[PDB]
């Protein structure tokens, strides 16, 4: 709980909903198994500088 400690340990969007913290991701990602990190699902994710 508390998306204020360090963004709730989320890689992106974080929601203090009720008690515990809830993470989520931009459009194009998917929340990882741990429920925090955001994994790309396509070749050119938004927000990421091309390589």
């Amino acid at each position: 709980k508390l998306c204020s400690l360090d963004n709730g340990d989320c890689d992106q969007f974080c929601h203090e909903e009720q008690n515990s913290v809830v993470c989520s991701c931009a459009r194009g990602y998917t929340l990882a198994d741990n429920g925090k990190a955001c994994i790309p699902t396509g070749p050119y994710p938004c927000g990421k500088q091309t390589l």
Binding site: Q12, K48, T50
Partner: protein, 235 residues
């Protein structure tokens, strides 16, 4: 872009340029998706017919990864007001979908609450464009990127000479010679977080270019987020 750095391969893939019939770039823009480019509303006045250009970083050579798209429909915010520059924002619908490749990738849209809290409280923000490097100089030929620190909502209002409404924020340097400038309007103002950038501002207006005691006013994207949604289905 007064001062600032230079975008390197892949550094600013969400940039987009609005070119006129004379094929000169007159404004900037951000890539949201394969079909939509974000931009400053007042930019739709300095050129009868125009097209959006992406994947370009040197307007005079050919990195080969450029692309000129045509506009199917231009969505302007109904409440725009030239006289005041309020509700200055528009979205463009591309006829031909954007093909994401190196130096060509969309920029993520934040979640309003999460944004204004975590994003808009970061120390800095990335502004970029092919705009004037000096207040009275010519326009840029290379794609630039400055790092504008967030200004205090209040100092901002005091330094002004005009009213910074609900729909706009300040960013830049008091005295430091670093600001955006002519031709950078509409241009992207992204904020970095854990190696990922989010759209948080549309190069709107400013008094001069990097003037002492003067700041840079961008369009508060976080506010028009619900708008940008139903606008990406045209409305």
């Amino acid at each position: 872009i007064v001062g600032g750095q230079e975008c390197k391969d892949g550094e600013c893939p969400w940039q987009a340029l609005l070119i006129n019939e004379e094929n000169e770039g007159f404004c900037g823009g951000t890539i949201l998706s394969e079909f939509y480019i974000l931009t400053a509303a007042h930019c739709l006045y300095q050129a009868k017919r125009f097209k959006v250009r992406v994947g370009d970083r040197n307007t005079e050579q050919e990195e080969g990864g450029e692309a000129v798209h045509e506009v199917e429909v231009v969505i302007k915010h109904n409440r725009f007001t030239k006289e005041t520059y309020d509700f200055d924002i528009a979205v463009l619908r591309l006829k031909t979908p954007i093909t994401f490749r190196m130096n060509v990738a969309p920029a993520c849209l934040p979640e309003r609450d999460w944004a204004e809290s975590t994003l808009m409280t970061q120390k800095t923000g990335i502004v970029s464009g092919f705009g004037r490097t000096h207040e009275k100089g010519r326009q840029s030929t290379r794609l630039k990127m400055l790092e504008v620190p967030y200004v205090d909502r209040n100092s901002c209002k005091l330094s002004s000479s005009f009213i910074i409404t609900q729909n706009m924020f300040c960013a830049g340097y008091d005295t430091k010679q670093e600001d955006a400038c002519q031709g950078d309007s509409g241009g992207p103002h992204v904020t970095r977080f854990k190696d990922t950038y989010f759209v948080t501002g549309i190069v709107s207006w400013g008094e001069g270019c990097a003037r002492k005691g003067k700041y840079g006013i961008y369009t508060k994207v976080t506010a028009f987020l619900k708008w940008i949604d139903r606008s990406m289905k045209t409305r």
